[PDB]
Design a protein around this nucleic acid. Sequence first.
RNA 1: GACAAUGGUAGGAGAGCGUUCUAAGGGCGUUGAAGCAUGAUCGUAAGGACAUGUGGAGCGCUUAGAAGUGAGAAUGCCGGUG
RNA 2: UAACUUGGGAGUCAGAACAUGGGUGAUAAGGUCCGUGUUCGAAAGGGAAACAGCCCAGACCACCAGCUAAGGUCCCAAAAU
RNA 3: ACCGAUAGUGAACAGUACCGUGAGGGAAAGGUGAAAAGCACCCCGGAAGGGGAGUGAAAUAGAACCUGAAACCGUGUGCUUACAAGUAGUCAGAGCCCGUUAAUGGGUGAUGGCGUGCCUUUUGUAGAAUGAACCGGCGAGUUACGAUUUGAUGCAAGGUU
Lengths: 145, 102, 112, 116, 48, 49
Amino acid sequence: MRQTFMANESNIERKWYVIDAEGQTLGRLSSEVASILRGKNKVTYTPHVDTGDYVIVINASKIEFTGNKETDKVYYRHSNHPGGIKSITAGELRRTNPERLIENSIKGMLPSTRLGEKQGKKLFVYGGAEHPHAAQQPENYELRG
Amino acid sequence: MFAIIETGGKQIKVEEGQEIFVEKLDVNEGDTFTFDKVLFVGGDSVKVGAPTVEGATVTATVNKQGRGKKITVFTYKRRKNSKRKKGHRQPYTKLTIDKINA
Amino acid sequence: MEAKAVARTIRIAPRKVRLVLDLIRGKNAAEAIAILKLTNKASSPVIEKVLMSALANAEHNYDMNTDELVVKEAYANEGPTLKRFRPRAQGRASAINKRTSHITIVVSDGKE
Amino acid sequence: PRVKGGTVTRARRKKTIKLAKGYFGSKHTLYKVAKQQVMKSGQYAFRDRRQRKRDFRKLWITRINAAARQHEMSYSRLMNGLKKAGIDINRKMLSEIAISDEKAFAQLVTKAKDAL
Amino acid sequence: AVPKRRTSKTRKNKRRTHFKISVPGMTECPNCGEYKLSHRVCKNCGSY
Amino acid sequence: MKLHELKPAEGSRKERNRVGRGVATGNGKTSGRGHKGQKARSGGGVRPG
RNA sequence: GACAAUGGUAGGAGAGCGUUCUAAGGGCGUUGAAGCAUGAUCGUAAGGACAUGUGGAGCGCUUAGAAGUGAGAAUGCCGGUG
RNA sequence: UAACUUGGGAGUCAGAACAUGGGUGAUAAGGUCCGUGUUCGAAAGGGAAACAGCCCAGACCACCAGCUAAGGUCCCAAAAU
RNA sequence: ACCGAUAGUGAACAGUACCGUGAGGGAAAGGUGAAAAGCACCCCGGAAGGGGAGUGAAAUAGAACCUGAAACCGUGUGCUUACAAGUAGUCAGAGCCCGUUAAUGGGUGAUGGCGUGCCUUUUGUAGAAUGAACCGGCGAGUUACGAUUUGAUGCAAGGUU
Ligand SMILES: [Mg+2]
Ligand SMILES: [Mg+2]
Ligand SMILES: [Mg+2]
Ligand SMILES: [Mg+2]
Ligand SMILES: [Mg+2]
Ligand SMILES: [Mg+2]
Ligand SMILES: [Mg+2]
Ligand SMILES: [Mg+2]
Ligand SMILES: [Mg+2]
Ligand SMILES: [Mg+2]
Ligand SMILES: [Mg+2]
Ligand SMILES: [Mg+2]
Ligand SMILES: [Mg+2]
Ligand SMILES: [Mg+2]
Ligand SMILES: [Mg+2]
Ligand SMILES: [Mg+2]
Ligand SMILES: [Mg+2]
Ligand SMILES: [Mg+2]
Ligand SMILES: [Mg+2]
Ligand SMILES: [Mg+2]
Ligand SMILES: [Mg+2]
Ligand SMILES: [Mg+2]
Ligand SMILES: [Mg+2]
Ligand SMILES: [Mg+2]
Ligand SMILES: [Mg+2]
Ligand SMILES: [Mg+2]
Ligand SMILES: [Mg+2]
Ligand SMILES: [Mg+2]
Ligand SMILES: [Mg+2]
Ligand SMILES: [Mg+2]
Ligand SMILES: [Mg+2]
Ligand SMILES: [Mg+2]
Ligand SMILES: [Mg+2]
Ligand SMILES: [Mg+2]
Ligand SMILES: [Mg+2]
Ligand SMILES: [Mg+2]
Ligand SMILES: [Mg+2]
Ligand SMILES: [Mg+2]
Ligand SMILES: [Mg+2]
Ligand SMILES: [Mg+2]
Ligand SMILES: [Mg+2]
Ligand SMILES: [Mg+2]
Ligand SMILES: [Mg+2]
Ligand SMILES: [Mg+2]
Ligand SMILES: [Mg+2]
Ligand SMILES: [Mg+2]
Ligand SMILES: [Mg+2]
Ligand SMILES: [Mg+2]
Ligand SMILES: [Mg+2]
Ligand SMILES: [Mg+2]
Ligand SMILES: [Mg+2]
Ligand SMILES: [Mg+2]
Ligand SMILES: [Mg+2]
Ligand SMILES: [Mg+2]
Ligand SMILES: [Mg+2]
């Protein structure tokens, strides 16, 4: 157990980025963002602490789909009551609460641990081009397509 | 200032003045050992050996031929009356790097 | 310093005596007498008889001032049980435990 | 002559109880259940001394892959071209240079990049 | 009708966290005596 | 010799086999018998011939 | 110094650890034996020493011999405790 | 690099899946009965989501060293958006 | 080269307590100290119990009297815990406390990876197949006489009672 750097608190630096979502497909945007939040682009990645940083998605009403999966691709849900299966289509969520469309796609790509829940709270999603977080001074980030 | 040597079956990153822990050499305490394979020198001037820097030794002095802490090896098969138990202490040498070359 | 007094082989069971015994620890002695005269458990006049004995040892054996004393410790340990029987029905019997207790309280003035 | 089983049974049982400090609840007091756990924890440790050499090699590659993409390289094309250049440095040593000395890491990137 | 497992020491002790007892009212006998119970009559060791 | 130094001739003695004492001796549980049938019972087996 | 081998149930073979007792030799003990408790010690394993507290009179080592010689389970027996 | 003879000491006589050649059955059965191979039994490790019998492969013990097999390289999750 | 109080007689203090209409069956229960010098006297308390004092080498040797394990019950505390899905650990690992048979030390453990108990029976059991509430003690290839094969030793066309 000779010599290997392990990250720590008082050791890590988190910053703020801004992605815009217009003209991007849903899953190919979301796979890029979920690796930012885990910190897998830092050279000091360590699996048991939270390195990785904050992401803001600002357009989120111009997310595209391919094929016919805006009338198909239903989202199911059960209320733990008998016969309580409920559903909504993907095109329905786009016109009504589109922020929950994107943040459900991204949190499904994160692990279900205690740390994975805490990393998913670093996501902020808004419909339309404004966000409140001008105090934290975020940067632009283009997707490495 | 910065060196990568190759000893045992593995590689060590050294700076002059520190202590290292290496699989057992065949010298005595207080002797001076020299390392021969050097793969990379950093610091102010950078030399990259392919595979070796062709020169560039590292001298070090020897302390404390020792044995590691005992681990216990134990395994068993579940419904079958079979198991075994044995101990192990791995040997090592401690050295202090005192001078670098290029 | 510290004074103590114990009462050994008290016929009340130890779970029953630890309930009232938790009200009085950490408190000074004048409040602790007032509490034990106003809780209507069966254990209360037995603890109160013991706390009187420990206060009297501090005055007589050690010459402390009884006006400012505090209860450091109060606890109850198990004694030996008495084993009885009770006939139930269809020729069968059942066992019954008569528990006992050792009660100990110490009292101090908080100084060395 | 009669030999009665005195004092050899406690001495065997106590060093199994003592070998189970810190276990939850009943598993650090009772002999039959502590023995059964100490057998299990020896089997785990044998398994995990082998996976420890896998976990750390996976951690090293993840950091090299992050550091190479700041120079527009995959992990795959870095260590392809690093082999053809003739470099024989570890994953462990290559991960420590990228954390400590970024300026030295960028220099052997170029020697791998022009060997392709 | 019968318990399937024994109950451990922790689960027994978590159950009787409310199995407690409270302190009584404890007013004072102002005329002469020690403490009495609230809204009661200081008959013995009391003049109120 | 002396009465505190005597040793037997080499290869004269062997310790005998105790059977049925724990797993690691090799004859622990079933004590050499194998699992069931008439030959595994006490006083079992059948007459010669 | 090289070369090779070393998963394993019924089961076969080999080497060993400990317990009680006996003979001989040589030793320890009220300046504290055996037992009990704690500890970050040694040995490839079974296991062996040291120190400190309790305890208040017997006990190890070497070689050999002899056995009521080693328990986690038998809806096992007996006692204590839940 | 085995084989054979003589002698001492055993345990075994409930077998299973897969592929393949056939009977029986209904070109039904995780069926049943024979032949030929592998594995399990008595075999951990990697893959097949999980999964005795399937694919790769046979654990003397340390190591925070490297090359590969079957299967794989968007995120969960290591490697080519 | 027999036992040492679950042993050895059923019985170290009994064919008694006890069970049965009766023939009959049948236990459990040893140890103060060298000496009783077996706690005068004072205090709390109705007493029982206790604190002092005193005897004694020792009273955590006070008659429930040698030593006093474990289960089990409690009181204090150093580190931790009220968004979390569990065969309870193991490998990695900050932060906080301490300081050893002094050595690449000890205690706790935010967080991450891996992970379906033990025996027996079975083709095959995490198994919703069996058994075990926990701790302690006891509890199962022996001996005699013959046979046959190995090894050792002595003598040898002889050997042996
Ligand atoms: Mg009464
Ligand atoms: Mg009746
Ligand atoms: Mg004896
Ligand atoms: Mg025994
Ligand atoms: Mg490997
Ligand atoms: Mg409680
Ligand atoms: Mg043998
Ligand atoms: Mg065997
Ligand atoms: Mg067994
Ligand atoms: Mg046999
Ligand atoms: Mg059997
Ligand atoms: Mg059979
Ligand atoms: Mg048979
Ligand atoms: Mg019979
Ligand atoms: Mg092998
Ligand atoms: Mg083997
Ligand atoms: Mg044998
Ligand atoms: Mg002493
Ligand atoms: Mg003895
Ligand atoms: Mg004496
Ligand atoms: Mg025996
Ligand atoms: Mg039993
Ligand atoms: Mg036949
Ligand atoms: Mg058959
Ligand atoms: Mg079949
Ligand atoms: Mg078929
Ligand atoms: Mg076949
Ligand atoms: Mg079988
Ligand atoms: Mg095989
Ligand atoms: Mg396997
Ligand atoms: Mg798997
Ligand atoms: Mg499948
Ligand atoms: Mg298996
Ligand atoms: Mg490769
Ligand atoms: Mg391939
Ligand atoms: Mg996962
Ligand atoms: Mg990846
Ligand atoms: Mg008797
Ligand atoms: Mg005794
Ligand atoms: Mg009568
Ligand atoms: Mg009797
Ligand atoms: Mg009196
Ligand atoms: Mg004592
Ligand atoms: Mg007693
Ligand atoms: Mg004596
Ligand atoms: Mg005693
Ligand atoms: Mg919380
Ligand atoms: Mg898991
Ligand atoms: Mg069956
Ligand atoms: Mg079961
Ligand atoms: Mg169940
Ligand atoms: Mg049962
Ligand atoms: Mg038992
Ligand atoms: Mg012969
Ligand atoms: Mg002859």
